[model samples]
Target: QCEVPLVRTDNPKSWYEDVEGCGIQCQNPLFTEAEHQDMHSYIAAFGAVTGLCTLFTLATFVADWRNSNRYPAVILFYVNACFFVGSIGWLAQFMDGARREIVCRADGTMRLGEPTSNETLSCVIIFVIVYYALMAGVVWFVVLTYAWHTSFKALGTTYQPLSGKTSYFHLLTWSLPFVLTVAILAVAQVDGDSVSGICFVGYKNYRYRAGFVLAPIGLVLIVGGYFLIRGVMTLFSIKSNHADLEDNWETLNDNLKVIEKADNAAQVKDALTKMRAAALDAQKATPPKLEDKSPDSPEMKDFRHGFDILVGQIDDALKLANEGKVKEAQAAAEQLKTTRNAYIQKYLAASKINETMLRLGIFGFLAFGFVLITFSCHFYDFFNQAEWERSFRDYVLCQANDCEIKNRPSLLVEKINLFAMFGTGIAMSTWVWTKATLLIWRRTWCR
Candidate 1:
């Protein structure tokens, strides 16, 4: 059944049926012509807002130092940029179509070969942007909360420095979701319809509904629950706060005690006098310790050498674990943990370094990739022009009336392109994974 015009006619049908049947009218008018016009106008207004956000994001990227120690912020900055671009791009398309249908005196039907290239591109770009923005926001939101918690609740503590392994962990975390998404999209491309130069999994399908809506919703719920629980504990639990402060203070006091024990005023004075006499005698014959000519400082070389050994140890531990040598792996893991703590204690302090930016960057990249794959699959109808063809002779008979076939050399070539993109995605994922694993290992085993 279809909808009919509100004007009284011989038509006897339900309101929804009348609206559907009439092609453009309804029996029980939900909105007058003016009201529909107003709705479209509001959409156009928001399109402008989206454009502004995109512009602002561009400005932020340009003015900020993206490679700073505050790498997490850089990651968030990139995500915000993508979000702005996607949001504006989508709104632009919506407004363009809405303007034609509602504001102009044109019929609502899509025109034949109206050159919707920009619209199609925007649709794909926007879909990718929105999904990525949402997911990146989720992951980084968790990270930001954790950073804040450590800084204040843990008595002005700094987060552990990220290792190569830790960086890889975050990279994987952000990226694996997209890999799964792209694989699903490839399958959708086989069975789905293409409209206006795009192939899409219809939103009505449960598979798409879960990936686009339910999964993100679930992630948000999980993050929100964790955030809420932490917030409650922070707000109400005096014991938790005290425990954190005490732990940090104990470490601080112990380090200070070591420094104090090394100091002796009387011995220091005597040593300085003796050293002055020795330096006077040596100055005439040899250069002083401060003026020694060495290519590399012993302290700096030793630090670098120590980290190299640590890396080898970590690699060895991982190999053992992979081979199911549990006992050896555990011992190695413990040793590696202690060595890492000793390094951190001797060199980097919490107040001077933070790895939140690196984590944020990884999460943001992953989110971006996931969104790209998801929207490209679901909105195929909006952008893929080849599927909407009206004739088969385009390929068989070389007729002008048929759609233009893309000159991809072979199926393998197309697959290779996808694989290459996937590889880039994996690289980003690997960095993130390594970062996360290292940080967790430090906090748990080392501490």
Candidate 2:
């Protein structure tokens, strides 16, 4: 009777060598039985919770679409959908893993093997779906980042426009991954009998895997990083200073000139003409008087009151100038040139406080929050090198020897992965729930 080899073999030359005949043969599991059970349970529970939360968010988005900004609404809709599908994928993987059979040998060792072709097919189909969902999730994350950057860049504009073509976003995030999955399947690149206890396309064709998986994620990280940094720098560059005041003055002056050029009553035209000339003369001598204006001057009482009085004087002067009181108008114009500098200084002090608040409230929170989540996941995965190495080694050994063995991932590593995924899910869910609640509350109160 030919008995299966007790020890793993380097190469097989005959059918008996490949057949299941070994004594005391044990299949390496990606996790111990206890760990496996815990993983499946956690996956199911967490996936269910995530899916429900995502569904709620999606429903809220649909209901609130009209009241919300369309740009963020579309981006967030796809993002929530991606998470929901990803949760479903995890649940599918759990179900697929449950069908695998472990047989106990005479020597008290257990070997894992697929009992039926249906089980193998099920695993393969679920693996493809899971990967597709994962890839789609990454693509949508990129879309969110791109949308944020675009919106931030258009901050001072009258409207914030959506950045990418929605059709293309749908295609890349959904259709492209399906095509890649089909292509991978067509080439028989996926391995059903993975040692990791999960059916996935093995690393034998690493180049293809990297192209389909790592490349897009890396591209997004690079692009998002660049834009995020650029955005932060741009936010810091906003200065409430004399330059802003000068620009405003120049703009107002130009508008007055346009009005002067238009057809008008002779007195009005003559007054505007004098006002323009006085403004020009004042501009030449304006700098010296601006330096001389004191905060303690009687004209500079409360900065707000001073500004209001100066504005009133300018309007009064314009009226006088229009009625042919050119000298009085010119005198008022000269007084304005002097006091305007001090008023601008006060304005800068007040504006800086408001700008700083806006900056901290908006860009500071968003930039930090995004980087924390994105890089935390990246670094957590990067540091767990041992888990990857063990998985790869067991996969290679099992493929070569045709032996089923348990090559369990480290418990700590599994915990980290679970923590990252669920933490992100909870955070996102909370945010959506809060926003939806606020919207509902506001609407109810308004009614």
Candidate 3:
């Protein structure tokens, strides 16, 4: 397309679809024996880092199994566990010449086509670990988005019923992948891509690859996107309700000062009448579920003390004024102002913090990022395969001249896709540590 000549091959039909590579010595090997070694090394390097991140994440989760063992945080914990084990499958491939077992024969020469489980037990075991963990992680992501949706959807109510059955999630996410991976090994379609230096199914046959790899991931991404968008809608409503509560207080606090400075009984009554109305409005305008209180919380205890005693303070002052005890009325009015200020200062204004508001906003951004990265990683090959077809196009199309290619386009995209997926696993760890660190750091920071 850019006037760059296509990389030529002698056996044009060798590279095209529906035809096996032509039987001729590769005139120009895309990857020399040495270059193939480096690709393996590069993949191993990233795989090592991915494993380390997940390993530490698993460690962190296990230490504080209680508080850390909650809904969405629990989701991240289990996902990291899957990747932590999956990383072992990756590193296992390159250990003690196991690399030879994966993509090369006993002599360490590349197996040109149809490497299967019958040849070595190592490949089958490695494929099982990698494929199971990969599929399980995808299902966990779907579960995470659904949790986000329920958190927003249910608002102030109990989140226990659907999510309460934590065991249900484990059953659904873990077993399906188990069943499918077992099926992959049974079929003998599992093969190693020399570029990625690991074994998985459908490397030679696109059918199983599309059916198992592409299809489940593609479907999970879709479900996550839907759950993510719907979760977004409910939070948007909560945001509007918060704004209304903010306005209501702005009006109530306006008359609070008038009570303290009132010079006489007549004017004190006027302020009391107006202030009571504003208090009523403020009480009703509070967001229904913003109650951050537990039954035994001092905040809840004082909550009743302030607002409950509040109406009596205003009424007592008004009664004193009508009894012509004007001086006493002024004294009680001043006490009324002090109580109002204490209530506003100690509890009312402070309790409205709705600090979870900050968390929800943070979660929205995090979930959205997960969605974006997830889409890109799973679908990377889908978008790229059409372009890669050109490199191998000559083999299938050429009569016989395309038998030899200067380069082995060499399933490079698979390596790229797998590496990026590992990169995301690292990113997932980064997300976890960043959140936990920020969570610990922000709360622990001197108030």
Q: Model 1 reaches what TM-score against the true structure? A: 0.37
Candidate 1, residues 1-447: lDDT per residue as tens digits?
222222222322211222332222211122346644444454445445544544544444444333322544444443354445434433543543432331111232222121132223332333344445445544544443343333323333333533223365356436744653454444442111111111222321334445544555355445544544564454333334333333433443343233234233333233223323322332222111111224366654554455555555555655655544555555654575565555433433222223553344344334434434433443332333233232221332242122343331222332333333233233333332344445544555655
Q: What is the lDDT of residue 357 in candidate 3?
A: 36
Question: Total clashing residue pairs per candidate?
Answer: 44, 15, 21
lDDT at position 156, candidate 3: 47
Give lDDT for model 3.
0.61
- Per-residue CA lDDT of model 2 for 226-318, tens digit only, reads 655665454443332234445555544553454444344344445444444433433332221232345455533454354465556556656
Error (Å) of candidate 3 at residue 280 is 17
Q: Model 3 over residues 1-447: C-alpha lDDT tens digits?
A: 111122223343323243333222221234556776777677678888989988777766665567568656687787787777778888886788666666654423333333342345666777788889888987887787777676654544554554566888889798989988877866767766555566777755555777788777778777866877776665664565466556544554554455456566676677676766655654443343544335456655564556556767877777876655767777776786677676644333322323443343454346446545545544555454445445545543453332544334434554556565676567656545656655554554664
lDDT of 3 at 269: 71
The runs of at least 3 residues in candidate 2 whose Cα sits more than 4 Å from the true structure, single-residue gaps closed, are 1-30, 65-69, 93-120, 156-160, 191-198, 203-209, 239-408, 435-447
Report the lDDT of model 1 for residue 5. Answer: 24
- Model 1 spans > 4 angstroms off: 1-36, 43-47, 50-54, 66-72, 94-125, 149-159, 162-177, 180-202, 235-447
- Score candidate 2 by TM-score against the native: 0.55
Candidate 2, run of 10 with poorest lDDT? 8-17
Higher TM-score: candidate 1 or 2? 2
Per-candidate RMSD, Å:
21.4, 13.3, 9.1
Give lDDT: candidate 3, residue 303: 46
Best by TM-score: 3
